[PDB]
Amino acid sequence: MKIPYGLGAYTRNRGNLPPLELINLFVEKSDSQGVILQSRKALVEVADVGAGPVRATFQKDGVFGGDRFTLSGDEFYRGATLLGTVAGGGQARIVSNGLEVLVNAGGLVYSYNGTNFINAGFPEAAATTIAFTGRYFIGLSAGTGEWYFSAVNNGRSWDALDFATAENEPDALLDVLVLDGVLVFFGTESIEFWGFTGDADLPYSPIQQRVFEQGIYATGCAVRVDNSFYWVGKDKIVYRNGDVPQAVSDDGIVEKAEGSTNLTLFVLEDERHKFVCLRGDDFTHPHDVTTGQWCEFKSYGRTNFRATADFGDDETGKIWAWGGYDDEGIIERLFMAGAALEEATQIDNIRLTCEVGTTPNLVGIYTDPTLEMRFSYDAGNTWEDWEAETLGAQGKYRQRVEWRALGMFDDPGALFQFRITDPVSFRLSDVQANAATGGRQR
């Protein structure tokens, strides 16, 4: 037959629901097989800077030849040169138009040019965010404030009379985003839209009847994923822009986001897989955007998958990319397959259709990966011992992975759990409950 294996990371603890979940495995389509589970690529080391938690990084091709701008700890690094220091704050941001590279924290705005790095001179003390690059530079004043704007392509000279107040949020302002020629201002209470005017004194004007009522949660909770954007909202429900804002988070992501009092959003780029990660206290649930299914990234030996607004680390000052396998030591990959059964059965067999015997190792302990499975009764509230089967050496492309002496299942549903914790790449297409016995040397 064919047992329905779970495609999402659904663990709800309101009731004692059966926790079908994915670990380091996401869903995509194919053409030879129908629906497939694929592995997560291991992490590498690309660029190393001075130690400390990396907060925000930046590099392009048309600015300064491609020099890597980072904010590690409390101070810059342009390559390995020190370039002064930054005041302390909450969330960082790097803005540039090619002739000058700005930076931010909760405290101050620091500009840069060919050889100097001093204060840009924001028209008051504090600042929240800076967004825009191509024509102006737009800053957000902390507290009950407005947004200021500089001169054309000149972030080193601000002005006090160049501002524009908002008229719908009395509490604060937290984030700003450039979606089109228009602007998007995130309040703590409402969301406004401000189009481009084309004047000299005031260059922007509001759109009248476009106000969303779900204000942003914090200062780092808005990502331009696509032609439109995402945010988090005053409550922990990740939304999506449209005619009306629709919601993409369901149960089991919403009730888990309350325990973390810190929530961020960022993208991770894969080849046509734009993940949208929701980083919290320990979890990291990336919402895939092409086939929209929640999954779970978890790095080994730690409390959370290490990442930030880019591929930087949260510790020791490291930046990487995706590449290869066998670099992070152990990559755990776990999936679920259940029956929702009602009558007493005789499960004589269980079967996987994975990729078989393509490990590149011949010396060492990883010449046979040996995944292992685990029975359960009573909807996964208690478990049984592991049963491990090998995956074969290299070149043995014909090796069935099966278990043959399972027994009886008197349950509201038989519920299995598979795991491989090993640097070998892993694939899965289908499972089979009961099959027959034919063969020619396999």
């Binding site: 590149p360 011949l362 010396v363 050496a393 290299q394 070149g395």
Partner: protein, 102 residues
């Protein structure tokens, strides 16, 4: 411009005239007895198992090396005994020899 010579491949045969089956080439590193990989296609992509097996008449499949690194091969029977051949540089280095000297 140059003439390449052809040699017909043989079978795995014993000390008598009979053919052997399940004979195993073990391909190694240069002189270290550590296993290396052997590829099955014209390119260098798909690598089959390092203990290879033959047919019931002693036909080995298409065996291709990687010319940038040396090799060493033996022969054994099915019971892992009676070593037939043992050749220490069984590969002829085309690029790996011209890259270090000459």
């Amino acid at each position: 411009m140059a003439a390449e010579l052809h040699i017909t491949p043989s079978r795995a045969t014993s000390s008598n005239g009979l053919n052997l089956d399940g004979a195993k080439w073990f391909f190694y590193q240069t002189g270290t007895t550590t296993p290396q990989s052997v590829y099955t296609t014209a390119a260098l992509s798909v690598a089959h198992s390092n203990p290879v097996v033959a047919d019931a008449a002693g036909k080995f499949p298409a065996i291709y090396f990687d010319t940038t690194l040396e090799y060493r091969g033996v022969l054994k029977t099915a019971d892992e005994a009676t070593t037939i051949y043992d050749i220490d540089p069984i590969n002829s280095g085309i690029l790996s020899v011209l890259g270090t000297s000459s």
